[PDB]
Amino acid sequence: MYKLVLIRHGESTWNKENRFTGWVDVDLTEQGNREARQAGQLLKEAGYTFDIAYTSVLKRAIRTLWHVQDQMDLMYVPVVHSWRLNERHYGALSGLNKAETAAKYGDEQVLVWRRSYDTPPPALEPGDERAPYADPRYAKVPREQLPLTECLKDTVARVLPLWNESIAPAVKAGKQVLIAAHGNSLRALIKYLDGISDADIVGLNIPNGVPLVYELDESLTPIRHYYLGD
Ligand code: VO4
C-alpha cells in the first residue's frame, strides 16, 4: 500500500483579486504563505514525511512547496519542477476578473469556459506578451506542444505523461511522494486515479493549501482518499 499526498497552491494574488490565472506566474499572498506553512505543520504533526516532491514551474505552487519543506525540515529532498503540472492554460481570459467577464459575456458563456471538458477558452494570439514561446521555463518543450489555451481534456493529456514516466515509478519504488500543484492539474490527476467521468470531474473543487492524501494499492488504484485537518 502507498500514500501519495497532493496540495493545491496557497491563495495567490489573483485568487484574492478574483482573476483567471492559468500560466501567468503570480505569487502567493501573505494568506497563501500562511496556508502553506499551516499545511506543512499539519503534515509534520501527523508524522508524514517525503522522499521526493513534484511541482510546476509556477512560483505560487513552488513557494507553497517551499513552506511545506521548511516547516517539515525537508528542504534537502529532490524536487522535480515540471511544466506538465502547470495549471490549466486559460488563454485570452488570463488576467480577467471573473465577475466582470460573466457580466460582459453572460453566465452561460463563462460556464462553458470554466466547465466544458473539451472546449477551451478563447486563445491567446501567438504574439501576445502572455504567450509561452520566449519563456526560459519552456525552452526545451517543442513549440507545437505549448498551449495558447486549454480545456481540461488538454490538461489531462499534458499531465499524464509525467505520472506514467516519473511519478508512478517513484511511488512503486517506495518513494514517499508529495505533489504541490494547481486546481486543474490536480483534478486531471484525480480524474485518472479515481476514474471520474468527463461530466463529474468539472464539479470537483480543491481548496488552497489543504493536504489531500490518497491511499493506493499494489496497482496504484485508490483505496481511499481524505483531506488532513479541520
Ligand atoms: O480561474 V479558476 O478558479 O475557474 O481555474
Numbering used by the authors: 1 to 230
Could you give the paper's own sentences about this structure?
The enzyme 2,3-bisphosphoglycerate-dependent phosphoglycerate mutase (PGAM) catalyzes the interconversion of 3-phosphoglycerate and 2-phosphoglycerate, a key step in the glycolytic pathway. PGAM converts 3-phosphoglycerate to 2-phosphoglycerate through a ping-pong mechanism in which a phosphoenzyme transfers a phosphate group from an active-site histidine to 3-phosphoglycerate to form a 2,3-bisphosphoglycerate intermediate that subsequently transfers the phosphate from the 3-position to yield the 2-phospho­glycerate product and a reconstituted phosphoenzyme. As a key enzyme in glycolysis and energy metabolism, PGAM is a potential target for novel antibiotics. Here, we present six X-ray crystal structures of an additional Gram-negative bacterial PGAM from Burkholderia pseudomallei bound to various ligands.
Two vanadate structures with Burkholderia PGAM were obtained, each with additional molecular entities covalently bound to the vanadate. One of the properties that makes vanadate such a powerful transition-state mimic is its ability to exchange its O atoms and derivatize with a variety of ligands. The crystal structure revealed that the glycerol O2 atom had become the apical ligand of vanadate opposite the N∊2 atom of His9. Interestingly, electron density consistent with a tetrahedral oxoanion, presumed to be VO4, was observed adjacent to the bound glycerol, occupying the position of the binding site for the 3-phosphate of the substrate. The tetrahedral vanadate oxoanions were modelled at 50% occupancy. The three equatorial atoms of vanadate were approximately coplanar and formed polar contacts with the side chains of Arg8, Asn15, Arg60, Glu87 and His182 and the backbone N atom of Gly183.
